[PDB]
Structure formats: structure tokens, C-alpha cells
């Protein structure tokens, strides 16, 4: 429930990694700051989920770093809780009801997701997400579908808009995502 926020200096390698990724598609924005969110209990629950996923998915690289735009007022909620059940920015559209994450930052930089606040600042997290093994989503999902109807325990881990060339992923569970970095920027 408790956490720390550490601002990255522009000259730190970590700053540059995050900024470079963001700027692949968001170079016309101006980055005001980049912070690392340190929430030990959330990190520990996320690592336990990764350890379980890594034990079951074979060679799959279960983790992706993806983007999530949100309004200024959701930042304290995400910082304490991650993208949990009460997170007001969960969405229910063509790929299911859950939390939506973008492969590319420009998608999250849309004003609909990273709403500019009264000072014009926009907020996009760069999030460790356990994408695991995924399939094509659909509007009815609140959890991902089962992989094999002949042994329906094991579900897909996430769903996506396009299995072989994804642009977004939907995660349905708490502790499937860790809000590692917060990028504050403007137009
Ligand atoms: N909030 C986000 O940054 C984000 C990331 C990826 C996708 C979306 N999209 C949606 O919330 C809804 C529908 C969709 O893309 O088709 C938002």
C-alpha cells in the first residue's frame, strides 16, 4: 500500500532507455520528467505472478514493456494499487473488459487516454506487463478464453488485437502489470 517515487535524471541510462522508446512514436511531445515507481508489495505480487507464468509457458518471453495513458487524477491510485479492480481507467471495447496497454506510445498519448490536465500535462506509464501466451480478444471477455476446450483450466494470459502483429494487449488480473515508470509530458 506504501510506495516511493524517484525522479530519473536526464543523464541516467535508465532515463534514456525509457525516453528513447517513448520517442519512437512521440518525438513531437516534450518530456517534462520520468519517474520510477517503487511499490514493494505490488512489485512482489507481480514478481510472484511472473515466476508462476515463467514455470508454465516454456520458451515464451512472458513480459513486455508497454504503454498506458491515464488522467492525472488516476496517478495516485495506480501508484498505490497498480491497475486493479477499482481502477477507473479500465475499458470494455472490442477486445474485452480489462486494462489496455499499447505497444507504441502514440496510441496512449491520445488525449482520450492521457487527458491533458489544467496545466497541459499528460501522463503515460511504461509498464511491465505479463502478456504470456495471448490470442485475439473479443468484446465479451472479462477473463481470457481457455486455450484447450479439452482441458479448459489453463487460460490464455492476455488478449490482443492481432496475434501476429499486435498493437495492444488487454490484461485482466491484478498483479499482471507493474507501473514501473511514469512519463509526464506535454504537446
Ligand atoms: N490507455 C491506453 O494507453 C490504451 C492503450 C492501448 C489501447 C487503448 N485502447 C482502448 O482503450 C480501447 C480500444 C481500442 O484500442 O480499440 C488504450
Let me know: does 169 contact 66? Beta carbons within 8 Å. yes
At 139, which CATH number?
A: 3.90.228.10
Query: Taking CB atoms and a 6 Å cutoff, what residues make up the pocket around ligand 1?
Result: 67-69, 91, 93-94, 100-102, 107-108, 113, 168
- Quote the cell numbers at residue 39: 511499490
Tell the residue number behind the cell numbers 506487463, with chain if given. 129
> What does the DSSP assignment read for 20-54?
HHHHHHHTTSEEEEEEEEE-HHHHHHHHHHHHHHH
Ligand 1, atom 7: nearest CA belongs to which residue?
100
Q: Which of 86, 69, 61 is nearest to 25 (CA)?
A: 69
Probe residue for ligand 1, chosen from 90, 93, 100 as the CB with the greatest number of ligand atoms within 8 Å: 100
What method did the depositors use to determine the structure? Answer: X-ray
Nominal resolution in Å? Answer: 1.9
Long-range contacts of 70-77 (CB under 8 A, 24+ apart): 70/113, 70/114, 70/115, 70/123, 70/124, 70/125, 71/114, 71/115, 71/117, 71/123, 72/115, 72/117, 72/121, 72/123, 75/123, 75/182
Boundaries of domain holding 20: 1-187
CA pseudo-torsion sign 104, 138, 63, 48: positive
Count of C-beta atoms within a 10 Å radius of residue 51: 9
Grid cell, residue 70, equals: 491515464
- Name, in order, each residue with C-beta under 8 angstroms of 49's C-beta and a sequence gap of 6 or more: 130, 173, 175, 176
**88 CA distance to ligand 1 centroid (A)?**
14
* Rounded distance from Cα 161 to ligand 1 centre (Å): 10
Q: Can you give the C-alpha Rg of the chain in angstroms?
A: 16
Task: Name every residue whose Cβ is closer than 8 Å to that of residue 176 and which is 6 or more positions away in sequence.
Answer: 46, 49, 83, 129, 130, 157, 158
Residues β-bridged to residue 64: 129
Beta-sheet pairing, 63-70 with 30-38:
unpaired
| Number of domains, the chain | 1
> Is there a contact between 158 and 169 (Cβ–Cβ < 8 Å)?
yes
Determine the residue of 77, 78, 90, 107 to mutate for testing ligand 1's pocket, defined as the one with the most ligand atoms within 8 A of the Cβ atom.
107
Quote the DSSP letter at residue 147.
S
Geometric angle at alpha carbon 6, from 5 and 10, rounded to 5°: 140
DSSP H or E run through 57: none
**How long, in residues, is the chain?**
187
Amino acid at each position: 500500500q506504501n510506495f516511493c517515487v524517484v525522479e530519473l535524471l536526464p543523464s541516467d541510462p535508465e532515463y534514456n532507455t525509457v525516453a528513447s522508446k517513448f520517442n519512437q512514436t512521440c518525438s513531437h511531445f516534450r518530456i517534462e520528467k520520468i519517474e520510477r515507481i517503487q511499490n514493494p508489495d505490488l512489485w512482489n505480487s507481480y514478481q510472484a505472478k511472473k515466476k508462476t507464468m515463467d514455470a508454465k509457458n516454456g520458451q515464451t518471453m512472458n513480459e513486455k514493456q508497454l504503454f498506458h495513458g491515464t488522467d492525472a487524477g488516476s496517478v495516485p491510485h495506480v501508484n498505490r494499487n497498480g491497475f486493479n479492480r477499482s481502477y477507473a481507467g479500465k475499458n470494455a471495447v472490442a477486445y474485452g473488459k480489462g486494462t489496455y496497454f499499447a505497444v507504441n506510445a502514440n496510441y496512449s498519448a491520445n488525449d482520450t487516454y492521457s487527458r491533458p490536465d489544467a496545466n497541459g500535462r499528460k501522463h503515460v506509464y511504461y509498464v511491465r506487463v505479463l502478456t504470456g501466451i495471448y490470442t485475439h480478444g473479443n468484446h465479451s471477455l472479462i477473463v481470457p478464453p481457455s486455450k484447450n476446450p479439452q482441458n479448459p483450466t489453463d487460460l490464455y494470459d492476455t488478449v490482443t488485437d492481432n496475434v501476429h502483429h499486435p498493437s495492444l494487449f488487454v490484461a485482466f488480473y491484478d498483479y499482471q502489470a507493474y507501473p514501473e515508470y511514469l512519463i509526464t509530458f506535454r504537446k
